[PDB]
Amino acid sequence: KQYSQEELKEMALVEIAHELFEEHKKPVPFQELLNEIASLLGVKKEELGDRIAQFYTDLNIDGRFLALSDQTWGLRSWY
Amino acid sequence: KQYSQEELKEMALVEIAHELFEEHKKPVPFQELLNEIASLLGVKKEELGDRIAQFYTDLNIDGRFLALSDQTWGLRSWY
Ligand code: NI
Ligand code: NI
C-alpha cells in the first residue's frame, strides 16, 4: 500500500475499502472488509461503531461498488 | 493440506470446500470457493460444470455449512 496507518486514519472507511479491493482484487464479504479495515487502523472492529452504517451506506451510494448476488458461506462451528 | 491433487480429484467438491474452510478459517463467496477448488484440481472453473449445482446443493444439505447473510461486495470495473 501507499498509505500509512495515520493516512488511513484520516480516510472514509469506503476509501480504505476501495484500496483494499484494488490490492486484493477479489470480492469480499462485508464483515471481512470490516476486519481488514479495523486491522489496518489497529483498532478492534467493535470500535468502528458509528462508522459501520455510514460505510454500508457509502458502499451503496458510491458507483464504484457493486453488491454481488454471490452467496457467502462458512462453517456452523464458527457461530 | 494433507491432500494431493489426485486425492482432491477423488473428493466431492463439498469435502474439498470443507478442508478449504478448515485451513482458511474465513467466510468465502461461493464463486471464490469455486476458483480455489478449481485451482487445486488444476482445471478451469468452467470445467466443473455439472458438479456446480451439485456443490450448491450439498452445501445446503450438509449441516456443517451455513449460508451467512453477510453481503458480498466488489468493484463495478470487474464486471
Ligand atoms: Ni454502489
Ligand atoms: Ni447447510
From Swiss-Prot, chains A, B:
It comes from the Bacteria. GO terms for molecular function: DNA-directed RNA polymerase activity. Residues 11-78 form the HTH HARE-type domain. The chain holds residues 4 to 82 of 173 of the full protein. Participates in both the initiation and recycling phases of transcription. In the presence of the delta subunit, RNAP displays an increased specificity of transcription, a decreased affinity for nucleic acids, and an increased efficiency of RNA synthesis because of enhanced recycling. May function in sigma factor switching. It displaces RNA bound to RNA polymerase in a binary complex. GO terms for biological process: DNA-templated transcription; regulation of DNA-templated transcription. The keyword Transcription applies. Transmembrane segments: none annotated. Keywords: DNA-directed RNA polymerase, Nucleotidyltransferase, Transcription, Transferase. Disruption phenotype: No visible phenotype; grows as well as wild-type at 25-49 degrees Celsius, no apparent impairment in sporulation or phage SP01 growth. Belongs to the RpoE family. This is DNA-directed RNA polymerase subunit delta. RNAP is composed of a core of 2 alpha, a beta and a beta' subunit. The core is associated with a delta subunit, and at least one of epsilon or omega. When a sigma factor is associated with the core the holoenzyme is formed, which can initiate transcription. One of its GO terms (cellular component) is DNA-directed RNA polymerase complex.
